Design an enzyme around this catalytic site. Structure first.
Site, short mmCIF file in Angstrom:
data_model
loop_
_atom_site.label_atom_id
_atom_site.label_comp_id
_atom_site.label_asym_id
_atom_site.label_seq_id
_atom_site.Cartn_x
_atom_site.Cartn_y
_atom_site.Cartn_z
N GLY A 163 -5.76 2.06 22.48
CA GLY A 163 -5.58 3.53 22.10
C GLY A 163 -7.07 4.05 22.52
O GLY A 163 -8.21 3.28 22.39
N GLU B 219 -15.62 -12.33 -0.19
CA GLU B 219 -15.20 -13.60 -0.02
C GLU B 219 -14.59 -13.87 1.18
O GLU B 219 -14.49 -15.37 1.52
CB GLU B 219 -14.01 -13.88 -1.22
CG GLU B 219 -13.94 -15.33 -1.52
CD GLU B 219 -13.11 -15.54 -3.11
OE1 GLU B 219 -13.51 -14.79 -4.05
OE2 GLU B 219 -12.50 -16.33 -3.28
N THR C 135 0.81 0.93 26.42
CA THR C 135 0.99 2.27 26.60
C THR C 135 0.05 2.71 28.05
O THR C 135 0.03 3.80 28.29
CB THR C 135 0.82 3.25 25.68
OG1 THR C 135 -0.57 3.16 25.07
CG2 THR C 135 1.85 2.99 24.38
N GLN D 260 0.73 3.92 12.05
CA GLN D 260 2.12 3.45 12.08
C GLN D 260 1.88 2.00 11.34
O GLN D 260 2.99 1.47 10.37
CB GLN D 260 2.78 3.26 13.24
CG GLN D 260 3.26 4.32 13.87
CD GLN D 260 3.93 4.50 15.21
OE1 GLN D 260 3.72 3.61 15.82
NE2 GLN D 260 4.22 5.60 15.79
N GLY E 256 -5.81 6.10 14.86
CA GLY E 256 -4.93 6.03 15.98
C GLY E 256 -3.51 6.07 15.50
O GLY E 256 -3.02 5.94 14.56
N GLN E 257 -2.52 5.91 16.62
CA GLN E 257 -1.05 5.62 16.25
C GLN E 257 -1.05 4.33 15.69
O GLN E 257 -0.34 3.98 14.75
CB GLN E 257 -0.45 5.85 17.52
CG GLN E 257 0.94 5.51 17.21
CD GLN E 257 1.82 5.79 18.70
OE1 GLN E 257 1.94 6.95 19.27
NE2 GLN E 257 2.37 4.74 19.35
N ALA E 258 -1.51 3.24 16.39
CA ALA E 258 -1.28 1.88 16.07
C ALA E 258 -1.71 1.54 14.55
O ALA E 258 -0.84 0.94 13.83
CB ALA E 258 -2.02 0.68 16.86
N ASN F 90 6.07 -3.71 13.53
CA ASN F 90 5.23 -3.34 12.32
C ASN F 90 5.64 -3.85 11.10
O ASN F 90 4.66 -4.24 10.36
CB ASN F 90 5.25 -1.90 12.39
CG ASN F 90 4.28 -1.33 13.49
OD1 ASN F 90 3.81 -2.04 14.36
ND2 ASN F 90 4.17 0.15 13.48
#
Ligand SMILES: Nc1nc2c(ncn2[C@@H]2O[C@H](COP(=O)(O)OP(=O)(O)OP(=O)(O)O)[C@@H](O)[C@H]2O)c(=O)[nH]1
Ligand SMILES: Nc1ncnc2c1ncn2[C@@H]1O[C@H](COP(=O)(O)OP(=O)(O)CP(=O)(O)O)[C@@H](O)[C@H]1O
Ligand SMILES: Nc1nc2c(ncn2[C@@H]2O[C@H](COP(=O)(O)OP(=O)(O)O)[C@@H](O)[C@H]2O)c(=O)[nH]1
Ligand SMILES: COc1ccc2c(c1)CCCN2c1nc(N)nc2ccc(F)cc12
Ligand SMILES: [Ca+2]
Ligand SMILES: [Mg+2]
Ligand SMILES: [Mg+2]
Lengths: 437, 54, 427, 332
Positions: free
Chosen positions: A143, A254, A179, A15, A10-12, A228
């Site tokens: 998204g 772990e 969005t 990015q 996706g975008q998230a 981000n």
């Protein structure tokens, strides 16, 4: 040495991946063309950064990353950004038509058209791995690609790699930054389908990251770039043991062992401090105890929730910078008194601790100030189920009118996967509550 | 407050600290469900194209 | 993600033609088609609405359709007429005579395949066709009847693209003929079924806004179409310019339309401005907000307080504080949280574009899916049956093959639509 | 204008707070499940605290303290006092108390200590003298019961040889100020007290309701603070402040200062206030004892006006401001 493959969806996901790999490069001293002066082991090495990079005959260090987006816009800025030379074109997969915020469109309709293509590009990096560990899968709950193509891809990975670990960095939906209005549907749909396929998932609630950027960075309305770069900081803290010499959290297994006793309940809350503004000209460097105390203030968590009203099952402290064990146990001692830290009766009331002496790395020109020491606490408290309550409630409100249900059905889905993914949730919320009272 | 398994190295160190002791579906199974929703789509489209034909 | 634009009939082509003027000015394209622009923002997404010609000219992806050569000769004579691709002036000669059956069933059947050919040509060129948007009016014959006919054929050939209309509702305050309620009830029947999004531009509202708010004594279609091209620019904004959103027709429909028939939107513009006269003080973000939600700024003559908002979408253009927008948009919801449904969480979404439109330093466009739009259809259904209960003027239609039965079905499908819109206003 | 919802219809208190709020012309009342409230006057059980403080642009405030049940549940209250250092087993104003479940932890070993001196061995749930008589009563109900040292020598009002309890109303605000309502109430038994017949629990159990004699010496078996202080002066040569109120202010401060780290909404994303009712028992030696802490507490009719207005000024308007005091600030 064992390798780790990162999958940004996706975008998230894509990015956030940019934010991380850029940060990794500064931390490891790789430059945007993929050359790493300090690597003498040219064209190879079983060094610990080789968990995240492979090296090329010509000495380039290349992310063990793949980026997949049903839509060309975002990965195109990858294809043309300062770190273009970093990636192999085959690593950046792109659709043409996105999934219109629609979980069913991304999983079924458009999903099925690219799942095979992605899994070959993924098998292409798996075939450069002497001892593949697992995957770090970055995406958003909201998204349609974020939520829907991740669950399809997750299921397959559990098939073509049943023996490897799958870790998730998931963005949980916040209306300030959101969005879309159907994001609660995608969150529930994707969690139910992805749950038995993720070994450990770190949730980042955009709400949290946003207020942190406003309070502690004096940023009026944070952009995704603001958010981000902060989310990478936490991602880097969480992945640093895999990329650095260390004794704590050295393989993806772990993280299960340390943070996930019961398997469903595999969402460790992350708190991180100190977040200091690079605009502040005079700053007083916080002490091991001041920063470690901040791990129990909600205002620092990746998800707002009240760990006082819940119980712990595990707890790591990941320090980066000028920390020594003694100052840690001191801050722990004093804090044990003053805080409400209740563990499940069947778990020791302890803290696994890691210190990396290299202090946190900040992006030249960023919003974060450099600091002498910093910590990221990872605590699997039941109080994170608050997030499931909230999301689940929204889901309930809309679904009682079946608002928007038709957009999903129309893609081939069935009104029943709605009540089935929500029953699962209703389980999960019950599991949490049993463990926490 | 017991400290334990303290490993050191040149990059940093790690350790634990106790304050108190206690007290998958098949590729074909995917193929099916994936394809069942492609059918349900092609049917619904046919009912559309039929009704438009009327 | 190209959009294919279609304007059909007198009303269709006139608002159609202003829109292209209005957005060509925003993207800095002139009537010759040559870009003489400031920012690059103006060309980043220019292909959504314009094809690019050798010699680096820009050609609107517009098909011009009419059953009469009148208005479409005008459009060519007009200020941006030469910009339009000549092969895309598809017209006949008879006229549809303010008759929905002439446009849907006889005169319009002869011409639709030739329109569809110009459509298909444009479609093939396209990289990722988003879908279609149509301007037309529901009260005459060409754009009303042929319009819905086209839409019914585009859906068959492109069943999975998006279908968008801007539909002018007839008003007695501004009406050409007595049969306009018949034509509108027939079309709305079509639109309930074959569009994803239609924007209900009520000519009654445009008249009131021109009369009352802008103090225009005797408003012309030109004064009304000025309002229309303002709204049409606004609701298009998040498709034509880059931003955080990156918006398209499908996501727009996915987020705005909870149930599929309920896809009729109330457009709003603020500040309302009258042609020529510019006033020189910009609004304060607080002002934009309460105007855009003010029914005096609604382009569909409904009272938003007589209904609940299922979903809302607002767009702020100009240089201004996103902080203050956020605070001001949050402020209207929490003040008037009643008038929003509780069972769609966070159903208002806001967006911002740096470039304002020609003539304002700041403006807000508003897209509302209120259950109060039923008020609109109730109005057209009453006017409808006033005549139908006496089978009045029906001969003009039975004369073209139509059947009383067909009228009962439309009247009825529409009365249903009102019922539906009334269900959710109570939940 | 500030908005508020209302999720406890049985609240005689906040019934008023809603009524008074609206009447300022600046508060509007949304519907139960409308999330866009500034204020939640919420339910008593399963109040959804994890949903508060997530409305952007909304300062949310609720009229309960997530966690306060520790102090307001009888088994919990014992658990709280035995195990927090701040209170300690050596706690001087709480009667001996043990939690016994029905299917004697160290309860039995205390009772036997009493066989060593044939000391008073009255207890309560309900009141008996032999352990067996009581223990068989808790397994007869099926839930968790707690048993306590009955106060065999209480203080009796004359004329009447009469028993009573004191309810103080304390208001903790969002800032964890601790406000004592100056108006107290003694709930008095019209029945002369005697220690032979416990099963005649009408002169032993001082509940206003359980007193289905109702109204003899004072109206509604309720004597307020002005009368009682006068009686104390005239009968015992003392005052309500010195002989009793101090200790009450010690207990209230102590109980609440204890649980503060666990419920404080200082750095939280929503905020709490809560009205509590503390119920004391003053024995013959003018010693004040803590009996029950009540988290959802009713007011006495005469005082609703005054208390419910002070709730608005202190806990509600302090946060949401509009266009001497009736409280004692207990200092910590
Ligand atoms: N923290 C953070 N969150 C993001 C970012 N980009 C998107 N999101 C969040 O992700 C949610 C939507 O998911 P997206 O990733 O944007 O959608 P997608 O994965 O591209 O799937 P599509 O529907 O096909 O576009 C929104 O609620 C955003 O808040 C980002 O760069 N950083
Ligand atoms: N240890 C003790 N010794 C003597 N009498 C006692 C006692 N504990 C309580 N009492 C008296 O017996 C009553 C026991 O009932 P209890 O205190 O449970 O009612 P309650 O306090 O739950 C009603 P409310 O919740 O409305 O205040 C007390 O109200 C008090 O009158
Ligand atoms: N707002 C507006 N409405 C118009 C315009 N022209 C016509 N109309 C309306 O459209 C209806 C007539 O339909 P019309 O388009 O002229 O007939 P057609 O050519 O057969 O499609 C009337 O009710 C008019 O009110 C215009 O320029 N602006
Ligand atoms: C219900 O919430 C919504 C409502 C609308 C939209 C979305 C969510 C997300 C995707 C597309 N979108 C928009 N599309 C277009 N064309 N214009 C807009 C203008 C302003 C705005 F705020 C949003 C949009
Ligand atoms: Ca090497
Ligand atoms: Mg995308
Ligand atoms: Mg006309």
């Amino acid at each position: 040495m064992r390798e780790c493959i990162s999958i940004h969806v996706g975008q998230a996901g894509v990015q956030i991946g940019n934010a991380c790999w850029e940060l990794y490069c500064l931390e490891h001293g790789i430059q945007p063309d993929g050359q790493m002066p300090s690597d003498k082991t040219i064209g190879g090495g079983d060094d610990s950064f080789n968990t995240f990079f492979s090296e090329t005959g010509a000495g380039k260090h290349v992310p063990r990353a793949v980026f997949v987006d049903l839509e060309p816009t975002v990965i195109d800025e990858v294809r043309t950004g300062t770190y273009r030379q970093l990636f192999h074109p085959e690593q950046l997969i792109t659709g043409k038509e996105d999934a219109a915020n629609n979980y069913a469109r991304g999983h079924y309709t458009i999903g099925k058209e690219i799942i095979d293509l992605v899994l070959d590009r993924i098998r292409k990096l798996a075939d450069q791995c002497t001892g593949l560990q697992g995957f770090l899968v970055f995406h958003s709950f909201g998204g349609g690609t974020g939520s829907g193509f991740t669950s399809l891809l997750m299921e397959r990975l559990s098939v073509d790699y049943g023996k490897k670990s799958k870790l998730e960095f998931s963005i949980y939906p916040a209306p300030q930054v959101s969005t879309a209005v159907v994001e609660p549907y995608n969150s529930i749909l994707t969690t139910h389908t992805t749950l038995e396929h993720s070994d450990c998932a770190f949730m980042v609630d955009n709400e949290a990251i946003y207020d942190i950027c406003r309070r502690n960075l004096d940023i009026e309305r944070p952009t995704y770039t603001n958010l981000n770069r902060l989310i990478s900081q936490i991602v880097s803290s969480i992945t640093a043991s895999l990329r650095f010499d260390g004794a704590l959290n050295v393989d993806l297994t772990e993280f299960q062992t340390n943070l996930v006793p019961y398997p469903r309940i595999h969402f460790p809350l992350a708190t991180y401090a100190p977040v200091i503004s690079a605009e502040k000209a005079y700053h007083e460097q916080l002490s091991v105890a001041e920063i470690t105390n901040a791990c129990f203030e909600p205002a620092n968590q990746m998800v707002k929730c009240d760990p006082r009203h819940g119980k712990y099952m595990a707890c790591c402290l990941l320090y980066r910078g000028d920390v020594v064990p003694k100052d840690v146990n001191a801050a722990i001692a004093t804090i044990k008194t003053k805080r409400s830290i209740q563990f499940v009766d069947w778990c020791p009331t302890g803290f696994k601790v890691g210190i990396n002496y290299q202090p946190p790395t900040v992006v030249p020109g960023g919003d974060l100030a450099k600091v002498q020491r910093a910590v990221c606490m990872l605590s699997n408290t039941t109080a994170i189920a608050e997030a499931w309550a909230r999301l689940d409630h929204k889901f309930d409100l809309m679904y009682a009118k079946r608002a928007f249900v038709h957009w999903y059905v129309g893609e081939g889905m069935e009104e029943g996967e709605f009540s089935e993914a929500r029953e699962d949730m209703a389980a999960l919320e019950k599991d949490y509550e049993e463990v926490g009272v | 407050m017991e400290v334990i398994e303290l490993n050191k190295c040149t990059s940093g160190q790690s350790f634990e600290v106790i304050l108190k002791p206690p007290s998958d579906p098949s590729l074909e199974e995917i193929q099916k469900k994936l394809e069942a929703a492609e059918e349900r789509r092609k049917y619904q489209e046919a009912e559309l194209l039929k009704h438009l034909a009327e | 993600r190209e959009i294919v634009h279609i304007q059909a009939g007198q009303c269709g082509n006139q608002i159609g033609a202003k829109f292209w003027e209005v957005i060509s000015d925003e993207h800095g394209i002139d009537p010759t088609g040559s870009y003489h622009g400031d920012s690059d923002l103006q060309l980043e997404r220019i292909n959504v609405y314009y094809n690019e010609a050798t010699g680096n000219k820009y050609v609107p992806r517009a098909i011009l359709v009419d059953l009469e050569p009148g208005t479409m000769d005008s459009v060519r004579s007009g200020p941006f007429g030469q910009i339009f691709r000549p092969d895309n002036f598809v017209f006949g000669q008879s006229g549809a005579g303010n008759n929905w059956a002439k446009g849907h069933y006889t005169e319009g059947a002869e011409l639709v395949d030739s329109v569809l050919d110009v459509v298909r040509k444009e479609s093939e060129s396209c990289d990722c066709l988003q879908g279609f948007q149509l301007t037309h009016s529901l009260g005459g014959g060409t754009g009303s009847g042929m319009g819905t006919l086209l839409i019914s054929k585009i859906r068959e050939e492109y069943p999975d693209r998006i279908m968008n209309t801007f539909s002018v509702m007839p008003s007695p305050k501004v009406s050409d003929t007595v049969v306009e309620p018949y034509n509108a009830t027939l079309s709305v029947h079509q639109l309930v079924e074959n569009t994803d999004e239609t924007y209900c531009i009520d000519n009654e509202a445009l008249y009131d806004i021109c009369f009352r708010t802008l103090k225009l004594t005797t408003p012309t279609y030109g004064d009304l179409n000025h309002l229309v091209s303002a709204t049409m620019s606004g609701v298009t904004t998040c498709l034509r310019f880059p931003g955080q959103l990156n918006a398209d027709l499908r996501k727009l429909a996915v987020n705005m339309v909870p149930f599929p028939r309920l896809h009729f939107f109330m457009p709003g513009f603020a500040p309302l401005t009258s042609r020529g006269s510019q006033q020189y003080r910009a609004l304060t973000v607080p002002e934009l907000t309460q105007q855009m939600f003010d029914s005096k700024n609604m382009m569909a003559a409904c009272d938003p307080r007589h209904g609940r908002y299922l979903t809302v979408a607002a767009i702020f253009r100009g240089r201004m504080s996103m902080k203050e927008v956020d605070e001001q948009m949050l402020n209207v919801q929490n003040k008037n949280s009643s008038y929003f449904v509780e069972w769609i969480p966070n159903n208002v979404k806001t967006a911002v574009c740096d470039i304002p439109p020609r003539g304002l330093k700041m403006s807000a466009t508003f897209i509302g899916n209120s259950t109060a739009i039923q008020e609109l259809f109730k109005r057209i259904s009453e006017q409808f049956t006033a005549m139908f209960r006496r089978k009045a003027f029906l001969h003009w239609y039975t004369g073209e093959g139509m059947d009383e039965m067909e009228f009962t079905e439309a009247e009825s499908n529409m009365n249903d639509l009102v019922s539906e819109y009334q269900q959710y206003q109570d939940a | 204008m500030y908005t508020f919802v209302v999720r406890d219809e049985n609240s005689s208190v906040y019934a008023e707070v809603s009524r008074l709020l609206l009447a300022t012309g600046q508060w509007k009342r949304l519907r139960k499940d409308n999330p866009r409230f500034n204020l939640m006057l919420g339910e008593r059980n399963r109040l959804p605290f994890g949903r508060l403080g997530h409305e952007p642009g909304l300062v949310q405030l609720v009229n309960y303290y997530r966690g306060a049940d520790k102090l307001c549940r009888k088994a919990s209250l014992v658990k709280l006092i035995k195990t927090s250092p701040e209170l300690s087993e050596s706690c001087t104003w709480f009667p001996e108390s043990y939690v016994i479940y029905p299917t004697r932890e160290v309860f039995l070993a205390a009772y036997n200590r009493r066989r060593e001196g044939r000391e008073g061995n009255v207890w309560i749930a309900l009141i008996s003298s032999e352990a067996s008589e009581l223990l068989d009563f808790i397994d007869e109900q099926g839930q968790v019961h707690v048993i306590q040292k009955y106060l065999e020598k209480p203080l009796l009002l004359e004329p009447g040889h009469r028993k009573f309890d004191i309810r103080s109303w304390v208001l903790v605000d969002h800032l964890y100020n601790i406000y004592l309502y100056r108006e107290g109430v003694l709930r008095t038994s019209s029945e002369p007290y005697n220690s032979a017949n416990f099963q005649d629990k009408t002169c032993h159990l001082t509940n206003h309701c359980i007193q289905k004699n109702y109204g003899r010496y004072e109206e509604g078996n309720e004597m307020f603070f002005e009368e009682f202080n006068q009686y104390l002066m005239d009968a015992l040569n003392t005052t309500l402040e010195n002989s009793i109120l101090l200790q009450i202010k010690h207990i209230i401060r102590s109980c609440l200062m204890c649980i503060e780290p666990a419920i404080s909404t200082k750095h939280l994303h929503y905020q709490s206030f809560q009205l509590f009712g503390f119920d004391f028992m003053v024995d013959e030696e003018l010693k004040v004892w803590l009996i029950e802490v009540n988290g959802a507490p009713a007011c006495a009719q005469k005082l609703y006006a005054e208390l419910c207005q002070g709730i608005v000024d202190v806990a509600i308007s302090s946060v949401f401001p509009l266009a001497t005091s009736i409280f004692i600030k207990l200092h910590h």
